[PDB]
Design a protein around this motif. Sequence first.
Motif, PDB file in Angstrom:
ATOM      1  N   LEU A 182       0.830  -1.192   0.000  1.00 33.28           N
ATOM      2  CA  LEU A 182       0.000   0.000   0.000  1.00 33.28           C
ATOM      3  C   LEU A 182       0.871   1.251   0.000  1.00 33.28           C
ATOM      4  CD1 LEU A 182      -2.534  -1.295   2.679  1.00 33.28           C
ATOM      5  CD2 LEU A 182      -2.694  -1.464   0.188  1.00 33.28           C
ATOM      6  N   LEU A 183       2.177   1.033   0.101  1.00 31.77           N
ATOM      7  CA  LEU A 183       3.157   2.111   0.128  1.00 31.77           C
ATOM      8  C   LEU A 183       3.374   2.657  -1.273  1.00 31.77           C
ATOM      9  CD1 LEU A 183       5.123   3.636   1.982  1.00 31.77           C
ATOM     10  CD2 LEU A 183       6.857   1.941   1.368  1.00 31.77           C
ATOM     11  N   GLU A 184       3.091   1.821  -2.259  1.00 29.39           N
ATOM     12  CA  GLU A 184       3.283   2.175  -3.653  1.00 29.39           C
ATOM     13  C   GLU A 184       2.063   1.753  -4.457  1.00 29.39           C
ATOM     14  OE1 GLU A 184       7.044  -0.248  -3.729  1.00 29.39           O
ATOM     15  OE2 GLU A 184       7.872   1.622  -4.517  1.00 29.39           O
ATOM     16  N   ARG A 185       1.903   2.334  -5.647  1.00 24.63           N
ATOM     17  CA  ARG A 185       0.778   2.022  -6.535  1.00 24.63           C
ATOM     18  C   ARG A 185      -0.547   2.508  -5.963  1.00 24.63           C
ATOM     19  NH1 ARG A 185       5.860  -0.538  -6.884  1.00 24.63           N
ATOM     20  NH2 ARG A 185       6.260  -0.563  -9.146  1.00 24.63           N
ATOM     21  N   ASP A 186      -1.562   2.533  -6.828  1.00 25.34           N
ATOM     22  CA  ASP A 186      -2.937   2.869  -6.449  1.00 25.34           C
ATOM     23  C   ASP A 186      -3.086   4.355  -6.121  1.00 25.34           C
ATOM     24  OD1 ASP A 186      -5.592   2.857  -5.032  1.00 25.34           O
ATOM     25  OD2 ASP A 186      -5.360   0.690  -5.262  1.00 25.34           O
ATOM     26  N   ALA A 190      -4.639   6.101 -11.020  1.00 26.74           N
ATOM     27  CA  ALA A 190      -4.767   5.350 -12.274  1.00 26.74           C
ATOM     28  C   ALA A 190      -3.864   4.121 -12.314  1.00 26.74           C
ATOM     29  CB  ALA A 190      -4.513   6.250 -13.478  1.00 26.74           C
ATOM     30  N   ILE A 191      -3.834   3.378 -11.216  1.00 27.02           N
ATOM     31  CA  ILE A 191      -3.115   2.106 -11.171  1.00 27.02           C
ATOM     32  C   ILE A 191      -4.069   0.975 -10.804  1.00 27.02           C
ATOM     33  CG2 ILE A 191      -1.295   0.761 -10.028  1.00 27.02           C
ATOM     34  CD1 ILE A 191      -1.143   4.533 -10.030  1.00 27.02           C
ATOM     35  N   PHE A 192      -5.072   1.309 -10.006  1.00 28.10           N
ATOM     36  CA  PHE A 192      -6.048   0.335  -9.533  1.00 28.10           C
ATOM     37  C   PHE A 192      -7.118   0.073 -10.592  1.00 28.10           C
ATOM     38  CE2 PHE A 192      -9.103   3.726  -8.341  1.00 28.10           C
ATOM     39  CZ  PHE A 192      -8.246   4.807  -8.305  1.00 28.10           C
ATOM     40  N   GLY A 193      -6.666  -0.313 -11.771  1.00 27.65           N
ATOM     41  CA  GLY A 193      -7.564  -0.552 -12.875  1.00 27.65           C
ATOM     42  C   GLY A 193      -7.244   0.347 -14.045  1.00 27.65           C
ATOM     43  N   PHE A 216      -9.328   5.921 -12.374  1.00 30.89           N
ATOM     44  CA  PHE A 216      -8.842   6.467 -11.114  1.00 30.89           C
ATOM     45  C   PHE A 216      -9.953   7.227 -10.398  1.00 30.89           C
ATOM     46  CE2 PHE A 216      -8.563  10.776 -12.768  1.00 30.89           C
ATOM     47  CZ  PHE A 216      -8.404  10.570 -14.123  1.00 30.89           C
ATOM     48  N   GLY A 217     -11.189   6.790 -10.624  1.00 25.72           N
ATOM     49  CA  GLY A 217     -12.358   7.486 -10.109  1.00 25.72           C
ATOM     50  C   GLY A 217     -12.340   7.675  -8.603  1.00 25.72           C
ATOM     51  N   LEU A 218     -11.677   6.764  -7.898  1.00 23.95           N
ATOM     52  CA  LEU A 218     -11.585   6.830  -6.443  1.00 23.95           C
ATOM     53  C   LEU A 218     -10.966   8.150  -5.992  1.00 23.95           C
ATOM     54  CD1 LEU A 218     -12.039   5.246  -3.792  1.00 23.95           C
ATOM     55  CD2 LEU A 218      -9.662   4.498  -3.983  1.00 23.95           C
TER      56      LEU A 218
END
Length: 75
Positions: free
Chosen positions: A45-49, A53-56, A59-61
């Motif tokens: 969780l330290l990197e990505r997401d 625009a990494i979690f799919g 990047f709507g989140l």
Amino acid sequence: GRPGVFRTRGLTDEEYDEFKKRRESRGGKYSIDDYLADREREEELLERDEEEAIFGDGFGLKATRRSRKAERAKL
């Protein structure tokens, strides 16, 4: 296998302090392995997401919805 009552893996003061805080949260019922398990999360969780625009494919989140044109923000 080894009789390690308390492991560390490689916890510095900071990770250990976080661990202490997290362990206090559990009333002392928080072993290093419980931390190390969520540590296995923290590093993921330290990197990505959060970099957007990494979690799919989207990047709507965390999309920057400025919304300066909204006559009806709530319908």
